[PDB]
Structures are given as C-alpha cells and as structure tokens.
C-alpha cells in the first residue's frame, strides 16, 4: 500500500508496544484512551512517536524492528511524560520543541543499549525513555524559565495515615488506574480502555497486567504509602509492566514463571517506592526505572530447573504464541 | 547425615563467607560474637541467612555454591543492617517481616549479577546486600510509619577537630572495631572474636584484615574525619574487606599483591568517605558499596608482570591454598 | 636518547591527549596556556600528569600506550580540577598531596575500565578522571577541615534572564572560552592557545572543537541558561569534547558523521545541564561526565548504512590519517 499508511501502521504498533503488545488495533484503542484522558498529552505522545520513528528510519535501523514498532514505544512515553510534568499547563505549544528533540534520542539509545545488551541476550525495556526523560527533567527543573516542571521534593514529615478512612472501592479502582498509569494517565476509563486493548491481543498479558497492578497496590500498602498516591495509581505501573514482562512473554508461561512474575511485581513495587524517595531529592520522578531494573535482574536469573525457560529474543511475540513455540520445539 | 544438620552447616558457612572464610567453626564464632554485641541484631541476621538459603534452594541454584555458603553471606548482612538502621529500638518483631522478604532477593541478585560478571570472571562481593539494603532503606526512609530508619543527613557545618584531644588507645582500638564493623557490630569484644574466627581458618586473611582496618583508620585521619566516627569503626570495614579480597585470595599472595592490597584499602577508605557524604543526601549509609567498587576495579586491573596473578574463580579457597595451587600449577 | 627526555615526551603527549591530540608541541602549547591562565593550576596539572605516568610505568602497563600518552591525559585533568575546586586559594601547597595520591588512581581505573570496555571495542574517554575527581570532591566536600572545596548548590529560585542585556561579543567569545574550559581554564587567551595547539596537529580536530563549543553555547541558550555561565564557558567543554570524539577520529570523517557529531554535541550539552543540576545536590560539578556518556552512547550506535563507519581502536590516530586509512583499506 501507500508508504504513509505503512508509516501510520508502524506508529500504531509502536504506541502499542508499551505493554508489549504488537497490534495496530490496540494502538488505536490506546490513542483513543489518551484522547479520553487529556488531548494535549495525547498530542505530545503522538508527536513523540512520529519523530522517534522518523529518527529510526533516518538512522537506517532495522526495517523489521521499525515495522514491529520497536522504535516507537519510547517516543510515545517521552512525549506523554513531557506533557505530564509540564508546569505551564495544557496546550503550551512550545513544549513540542523539546518533544521533537528528545524523541530523536530514543532510537540512538535504543541502538546503543542494544549493543550493550546483546551480549547477554537482554531486550531493552523503555530504558531510552527513562534516560531521555531524566535528562530533560534534570536539565530543565522546576525553576526553568522556558519549560518549568512540576515540583517533586522528598518527604520531610511523617505521613498521617488514618486507616479507618481507607476506601476499598478506590483501593480496588487502583488496579485499572494502575494499568493506565503506565502512560501517565490517571483516568479510570482510559485504564479500562487499556485493559481492553491488552485483552483484544492476548488474554495472558491482560491477566498479568491486572495481577501486577494489584500486586503493586498491595506492596504499597505494606510500607504505609499515603492513600492518595495509591488511589492515583502511582504504585502499580512499574509492577504491572514487570508482571507483563516476566509473566508469559520473555519466560515461557508456567506456574513457576507465574510465581516468578508475582515476585518480580513485588520487587518492582518496592524498588518503585525506593526510587521515588531517592529521585525526589533531585526533583525527578521514578519514570519506569523500577520496572527496568526489576525485569532486567529477573531475566538474568539463571535457574537449573527446566520449567523456567527464557526465550531467545528473535522469537518472542506474545505468551500464547511463545508457549506454542516452546511446546513445538520441545517435541 | 540428617538434612537439617547439613542445612545448618550451610547457614554457618554462609555467615562465615562475609570475611571470605569457609569454615563452620568460624561461623559459630561469628554468631557468638553477634550474640555478644546485640541479641536482636543476631536474631535478625540469622533469620536473613536462613531465608536466603531457603530462597537459594527453592530457585534451584547450584548445590556446590549453597554448600560452600555462597548464598548465605548476603542474608546475614541484610538482616543485621535491617536491625542496625531501625528506629523502633530492639525486639521490634515486625521488622522480621521485611527481613524475610528482602533476604529472598539476595539469591536472585546473586544469580543476576553473576550472569553479568561471568563475562569478565569477576566474583560478586556482597553487591546483592548493597542493592537490597539500599532498596529497603530508600523505600522506608526516616519518615516511614511502619519501619522508620535512623536519620542520616549530610554535614552542613565544618567539624571541630581538637587534635590535642585525640586518644591513641581508642585510635588503636579502631582496628578490632573496624573488623567488627563489617557486620555492623561496634563492640571491641566481638571484633576480637571476629579476628579469632578469621585466624582459626587462615592467618593471612586475619593479617590482611588487620592491615586493611588500620589502613582505613589512617586514611580517615588524612581527610580530617571526626574522631567519633573513627573510634566507632565506621572507617575501617570497607578497607578491611578490600584488603582481604585483594590480598591473598583473588590474587596469588605476593609482596606485589600485598602492596596492591594496601593501595586497594586506601582507595576503599577514601571511596567510603566519598560515598558516605554522597549517600547521606538520600539518607542512606554507604553499606559496603566502597569495598565492592574498589575490589571490582582492582580485580579488573591488567598488569604485564607475572607476579600479579588473578586466580580463576573455580579454584579460590583461601590464600595459603591459593599459593599452594599457584606453585603446583607453575611447576 | 636519555630516559628523562623520553619521559618528558610522554608527559607532553599525555597532556595533549585531552583533546585527542598526540603531539608534543601541542603539549608544550597547552602547558604554556596553563601558565597563562594560572601558574598554580598548571603546577597541579603537571604534577598530576607526572605521577600518573609514574604509576603507569610502575604497574607495568603497555609501553606503546604510555609512549602515546594514553596514561597521562587523566592526571593533568585530575590536578587541574583539584586546583580549580580548592577553597584555600592559590599555592595551597598541601593540595599537592591529594594530587599525588589521586593521580595514582588514574592508571588503575584506565586499565579496569579498559577490561570492561574491550568487549565492545570502546575506548575510555577520561572516565578515570571523572571517577577519581568525583571521589575526591565527595570525600572532602565544602566543609572539610583540610581541603575544602568551592560550594556548589542546586538552584532554588527562578533565574532572572534579561534578554535585552545579552552581549553577542561575549556570546561569541564563549567559543574559545568553551575550548579552554576543557582543562578548567576560563581565560580567552588560553582558549586561543588551545585552538592553535589543536590546529597545528590536525585542522579537522580544531574545526570540530569550534563547532562543538558553539553548539554547546547554542544548546545552553535554548534552555535559558544564566548568561554568566555561558560567558564563563561552562556550557561548551563537554560539547566540544563530544564533537571532537565523534567527528572525525572514532568515526571516519564524512558529512553523515559530521551531522552525527553535531547531534552528539547537542546531546552532550543538554546532558551537561542535566548532570550539573543533578550533581549540584551532592555539591559536585559535572566534570566531563556528559561528554563521556554522550560519546559512549554514540559510539555504541549501530547503523546499517556504510557511510557511518567506526574504526578499530588499534588504528586511530587523527581524522585525516583515519580517512586515509579507510580509503586505503576500502580500495
């Protein structure tokens, strides 16, 4: 077909790869959810994805990786988190100019880390996004004249946690909001749209997403996390990403790997709290760093039993197809 | 014999591996020293070791490594440093619940880092402990409602150092206290018990431990470190660990390697001061990070002369046996 | 000739390797520029270079690398930045004692990182300097009794930027000052001497240095950097180093690689602002870390087109000779 249609297909698959989903319809649903949440944030994310894919094409990256969407799933997060942590409000058009520039750095990093990560057959997990956004938010800061950012500061007083005022409806609603917080969206409806987008592709990914989000919520209750943060979904996006990554895609789905994924979700939630407290000193948020560290430390794990099997990266599509491939190769 | 006795043997060897010693009697002496220092801290450390070894067995790790104690020497430090930096006092029983959870992460990290470190034949040096404890102490912080930690803050004023008030008896006693501070214990008697525990296995390890501790003390006097910190042994545990690691075990013991070990002790003490000042910003202590960085940067050193020889990890037991093996292989 | 003359030749080539130049006359010009700027800083830098080369010889490093100057280009920066960030003024003779000690750590790190970086054929880019100086400045701090450092603190208020008061003469003069700031020198005359020193060896290196400095200046205007910082040259030394590294030496010089070098300069300037803001929290400056990170992430970049070619490290001299070698090997 026309090259423009193929490029938009690449953009859609890139914006879907965030929850490790390669499906253009899932991309359309995710874009619709972003419009539901905040049109400005969605515009920023779409611009980030588009410029990231242009940078990937310019730098003569692999055509298969671009077609899959491997080079667009960092631009969308870059744009969305540029828009989320902007202190100038909505439709601050000049914010698009950083978004164009920083999204150019997503492919480069994605290649560079790849050269590092090829030696241990490790895939990159949105690390280009974390590095680029940390770079931007540190360079600008809350006291920038042009692109001020929302002020994040370390807690200097003991939080007041009235356990009699906990609301279990909101605590349960933290699950879809935890799913939607992967992109930075806090609207429960866009969380539901995201859950539908994952389910239309593969039910195992949706199940592991829900399990990871609820595990992050529970792990955040364990260390007396303020209730507003949990209700806002801040404690479940690293956990849901880790659960999706370790559950059935990069490990062949098995009950052993399922328990490993739950453990990875717990590790990612605790590391999320830790990185939030540490990075608040610089004024930066822990944007998907915890998921990266936990998933990478759980993919490098070497275990003797044959149930825990790590797939080669060349043959990773989605948990059902992964299990089918493992069963075919074994027989 | 009965599996329980073998498991307790594994726990003892694990709690001895901290100073790179593989001897159950040394483990018994170290546990006795911990009881001498603080029974609560010792209970926490023993629980950490036990749950770390259970996690290692569950994750089907190598049986030889578990039997040596390679998977228990991070749990003991994790438990001990959970107990040391607890603001709730002694016998705060709920602190055991983090200790169980965090000690599960010691084997995983120990495997993961191993997969990273196998490419350069580097052994892991309590990095799982540092990562896990940094995670915990950052997640909780001093203002946590459930598990508050002791407050560490950067120095904001010039220390007052009356050099006429220096006490050379305490300055000398900083050596055994420096040895005992590896576990977090400040009692001089438990430092002496630790020195006995190292000596009963191999005198070279004890000699290098004393040299490293005194080198850390001297290096801390060089940059006007407050006298209370030196008397408390805080400046000599990274140095003693680095001296033990580089002295005669991972390098064949020779006067060249001895001077290299002294240099590594100096580097580790200065890096310890640096990491203390940096990490105090987040409120975290430099728990054995300096020893890790210094020993890793000194094992990667490539030198043309044949005197400085680095042993393959498969054949590292203790300095006397290491030198015997080197002399046998050379001839 | 006499060994002393060869040793001084090694020192000169080492002090020239900072801008990736291997020429003793360039070393003489750089030393002259340092005397023009500040005799105390130059004395500190020369002592650092000398002791670094002695440490390299003692540790039996490669004779070819020492003769090239590969082990002296970290000592000079170490000494110069010890002297620049000293709060005791000029000719504080005791500062030489750290300078001797810390410069011993430049070869060790240079070897250690090499063992890490040999797997991906990456050269080390003054990382030993960054690690050592960060170690020193964190260990001492602004409140040290013996070697206090200049106080660096994060910005806590919005800067006042009167754009009508911008001075384009000083803005243009930020280019030679940006070149001279690689060593920490702020004098425009020593910047001109440095430009002459680069040009006498290879015009491409000088051109890329000027382009990188002006690119860093422009990138610093983009995020509303205070005018005093830009006039002082603080925003152009990481950028000029990155432009020199990526322009024509480690990549065969081509218009594609030229655009890549400009992009690397932009990335390095933005990362320089980010690292300045982050490291100001600890009180440390971003001493050449941004150039390191940007150049390393741009050398690991893998690109399919044949124009972007990365040379093996064994055959990298300077851009003209590099292009000659590439053209000879291709034919």
Curated annotation (Swiss-Prot), chains A, B, C:
Glycosylation positions in this chain: 160
Membrane-crossing residue ranges in chain numbering: 27-47, 65-85, 93-113, 122-142, 191-211, 230-250, 259-279, 281-301
Family stated for the protein in its record: Belongs to the urea transporter family.
Name by which UniProt lists this protein: Urea transporter 2
Portion of the full-length sequence here: 574 to 904 of 920
